[PDB]
Design a binder for this molecule. Structure first.
Ligand code: FAD
Ligand code: FO1
Length: 519
DNA sequence: ACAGCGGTTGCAGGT
DNA sequence: TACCTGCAACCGCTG
């Protein structure tokens, strides 16, 4: 009987050559938890153990760099995320395969060599993803590969929101809420089960030439300019995502009473959750986070509501996802159905100054430096610098600010970055352009001593709180006494806010009329 | 039809 | 304190 059982597994070792492959394709959805596309594959494999190999893949795609600027800090985040993801898949008797190449070229090969029966992935609405996925579905159809996609990057499916709103994406938040209240949310899933009867798949032609061909990229492979790395304040991956979420949810009174407008842009520690990079890469399920918040809200029936509550912030994400789904030119002014056409000026020197936090406005400069160094800044810090760049002071296109954020943010999100840049430039969604953030006054409310400025603009760290926000008010002798002379150790302010913002408000009114008269 | 309402997160000067 | 008004007056939705 022991002899018999031995004969059985020896024979099955030949049978293994006859297996087809089930592929889950990670792009976002970079997590095991609440991942229906992944769970699909793992359930299919375990429902028929012996029949399939499982290949969880991430395609490290050179085409991304034709579309997106990616700074060193975000490359490091991705490196860490893929490593965490392989660690978690290992626990399930699997692993991550990181296939280098463009999807259009990779998929023809692997469909054939792995004998792929089914491919799953989490859907996405970005133009890159739309064109990519269309090409892959086309190829899978031709090649007879079953493709099942799942919508789980968002709580609501943009397509279904647009359908329920009679074919149009809602363009106001309250209307969006009224629509999504009528939609059901799928069940939030746990991590998939361990794979049964899953020997490692046989090496393909690539693996045969280099056994490490699909192994997780190193820092050296992914970060080509490590001199641009800052402190690793927000480590990548689902494990860190979940730890951070549980920590952020620990104070249920803080959660229950959360109002975004009352959180500081310049607290030295984040005043909000900093779950955004995790949500952006899919290291954290938005649907799980929402579920967790809802549990807390049950226990704390006295709680804040949208727009300002924590659930409210998730809904903003959903909101911008839906409007972005409907408009591939979401990230440009021209041809963007939502966007006010505003004659922004080009000014290379001012853009450079803003980009590198050398505007001569300490608050603005502090924020831009934190962003560059750390890759996260608070929402209202983003407001301050985005308003400054666009309608507030420099009159430079929101698209140029978008580009800088796109490089520097760990949470860089096509829809969210574009949506909020339009908001802040009063190009779309927000239209009360008479409200202009003051680069001098805005930060004072939450940091009267200027601690944040003293940290990120250390050259000004000896200035009295009375002029650290407005160092040009200090005489030359006082500047010398504070160890920082304007024009020498810190730049002269590149524009005068008190003049230019009034001029820009007039320009905004004139642009608005032109746009009105087109309709 | 177009007035009235509400709109995540303005500032300054004031109660 | 947490809130108010004046400042000029925008948008989309609603009826
Ligand atoms: C000009 C500008 C550019 C921005 N670019 C991005 C970006 O590329 N990627 C990005 O994730 N956020 C972006 N934001 C939105 C917002 O600032 C960040 O989501 C937020 O600061 C992240 O911090 P948090 O996770 O601690 O937010 P929390 O306040 O803790 O909110 C929780 C989650 O809700 C979502 N959320 C919060 N605020 C917004 C918002 N305003 N719009 C949409 N979703 C929101 C995020 O996923 C966030 O993680 C931008 C904002 C501005 C003003
Ligand atoms: O499929 C990929 N997605 C990558 N993405 C994820 C990307 O957001 C999704 O592929 C989107 O679906 C593209 O529209 C990255 C995102 C970043 O912010 C930075 C780098 C990458 C790199 C890749 C990549 O190599 N392959």
């Amino acid at each position: 009987e022991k002899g018999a059982s031995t004969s059985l597994y020896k024979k099955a070792g030949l049978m293994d050559s006859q297996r087809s492959t089930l592929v889950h394709w990670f792009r976002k959805g970079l997590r095991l938890h609440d991942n229906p596309a992944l769970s699909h594959i793992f359930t299919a494999a375990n429902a028929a153990p012996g029949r399939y190999f499982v290949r969880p893949i991430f395609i490290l795609d050179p085409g991304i760099l034709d579309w997106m600027q990616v700074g060193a800090n975000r490359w490091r985040f991705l490196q860490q995320t893929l490593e965490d993801l392989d660690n978690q898949l290992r626990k399930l008797n699997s692993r991550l395969f990181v296939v280098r190449g463009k999807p259009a070229e990779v998929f023809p090969r692997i469909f054939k060599s792995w004998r792929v029966e089914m491919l799953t992935f989490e859907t996405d609405i970005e133009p890159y993803s739309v064109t990519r996925d269309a090409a892959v579905q086309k190829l899978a159809k031709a090649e007879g590969v079953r493709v099942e996609t799942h919508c789980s990057h968002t709580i609501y499916n943009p397509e279904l929101v647009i359908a329920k709103n009679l074919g149009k994406a809602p363009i106001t938040y309250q209307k969006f809420l009224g629509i999504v209240e009528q939609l059901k949310v799928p069940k939030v899933l746990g991590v998939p089960e361990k794979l049964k009867n899953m020997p490692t798949p046989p090496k393909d032609e690539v693996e045969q030439k280099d056994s490490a061909a699909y192994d997780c990229p190193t820092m050296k492979q992914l970060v080509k300019r490590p001199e641009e790395l800052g402190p690793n304040k927000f480590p990548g991956g689902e494990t860190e995502a979940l730890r951070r979420m549980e920590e952020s949810l620990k104070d249920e009174i803080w959660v229950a009473r959360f109002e975004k407008p009352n959180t500081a842009p310049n607290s030295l520690e984040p005043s909000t959750t900093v779950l955004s990079p995790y949500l952006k890469f899919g290291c954290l399920s938005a649907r799980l986070f929402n579920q967790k918040l809802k549990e807390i809200i049950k226990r704390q029936p006295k709680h804040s509501q949208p727009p300002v509550s924590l659930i409210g912030q998730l809904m903003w994400r959903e909101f911008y996802y839906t409007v972005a789904a409907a408009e591939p030119n979401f990230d440009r002014m021209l041809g963007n159905v939502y966007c006010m056409q505003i004659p922004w000026q080009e000014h290379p020197d001012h853009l450079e100054a803003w980009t590198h936090g050398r505007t001569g406005y300490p608050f603005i400069d502090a924020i831009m430096r934190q962003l560059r160094q750390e890759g996260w800044i608070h929402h209202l810090a983003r407001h301050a610098v985005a308003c400054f760049l666009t309608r507030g002071d420099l009159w430079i296109s929101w698209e140029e600010g978008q580009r800088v954020f796109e490089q520097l943010l760990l949470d860089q999100d096509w829809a969210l970055n574009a949506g909020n840049w339009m908001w802040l430039s009063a190009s779309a969604f927000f239209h009360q352009y008479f409200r202009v953030y003051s680069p001098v006054a805005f930060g004072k409310k939450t940091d009267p001593q200027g601690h944040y400025i003293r940290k990120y603009v250390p050259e000004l760290s000896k200035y009295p709180a009375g002029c650290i926000y407005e160092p040009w008010k200090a005489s030359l002798v006082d500047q010398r006494a504070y160890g920082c002379v304007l024009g020498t150790d810190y730049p002269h302010r590149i524009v005068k806010h008190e003049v230019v913002h009034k001029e820009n408000i007039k320009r905004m009114g004139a642009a608005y009329k032109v746009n009105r008269e087109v309709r």
